[PDB]
């Protein structure tokens, strides 16, 4: 895919164009106050090695870092999310895959009041990359889910259990 980083808002200052995964970006730029994404869906992290706060971005021009809900201006690592073919995920009521469960194939902007059960504690990502938000309507802390098991909340990198919405990481352009 193609992404460009700008140290200063309005697409100015020092810039660094990246075309794939990058475990560390601090040697290239020290602050990101603007970004242009020409293609692909990316996940950005506040720290190196893909740690700390995550942010999903797609095609579009961002003159200001609030355009992607940035907590601040640090972006020290990035991941290019591959092209998925079909999305399939199961949402469980209790931890370790217990209680009732549902299998969704599309976006849910409200998790606690959409299904036959309100509590949500584990996920098994059967197919495709998904983005998890702590709030409804895709707000709050974001967490990338790649195909695999997410038995307990820590597995998805959160420090708490708040989830509010789930959306398939797909391009919308």
């Amino acid at each position: 895919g193609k992404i460009t980083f700008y140290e200063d808002r309005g697409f100015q200052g020092r810039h660094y164009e990246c075309s794939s995964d990058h475990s560390n970006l601090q040697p290239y730029f020290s602050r990101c106050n603007s970004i242009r994404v020409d293609s692909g869906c990316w996940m950005l992290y506040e720290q190196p090695n893909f740690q700390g706060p995550q942010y999903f971005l797609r095609r579009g021009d961002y003159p200001d870092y609030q355009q992607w809900m940035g907590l601040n201006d640090s972006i020290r690592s990035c991941r290019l999310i591959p092209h998925t073919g079909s999305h399939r995920l199961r949402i469980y009521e209790r931890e370790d895959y217990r209680g009732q469960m549902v299998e969704i194939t599309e976006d849910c902007s409200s998790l606690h009041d959409r299904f036959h059960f309100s509590e949500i504690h584990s996920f098994n990502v059967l197919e495709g990359w998904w983005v998890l938000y702590e709030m409804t309507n895709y707000r709050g802390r974001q967490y990338l889910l790649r195909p695999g098991d997410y038995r307990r909340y820590h597995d998805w990198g959160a420090t708490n259990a708040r989830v509010g919405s789930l959306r398939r990481a797909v391009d919308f352009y």
Copy 2:
């Protein structure tokens, strides 16, 4: 369990008490216009060999055959439903287990407007005996589901795909 059949309403006429499965009842009584169930959950059929219309009955006294939603007064076979330990069933959106799906553990009086999807075409009974109705709030044609696969509607004995509610076959007394 214990069930008694009465040819005439109000608990009168010729009576036949049954304590288990019975492939044929026509040699004992020719019409059932009343029934007393002292214990256990039973499924009754209009014809011998457990075929035709089915009816779920439990503890209670029935002076008239409308008390169990009888289409008429024929009862030619019966089955005693065993004691289940936990109920677990999956409901699929499309036939042969396709589309989204949900796993329920309790009674649903409204199937088409309870989950994230409205269409319902197959069931996999993971545990326990369940009763399926064609209408909402446990009305219409009844179909017994024992643990197993129900990929297409014919598998549950219906001549059409109308389903409206599902309830666990358990004693409520």
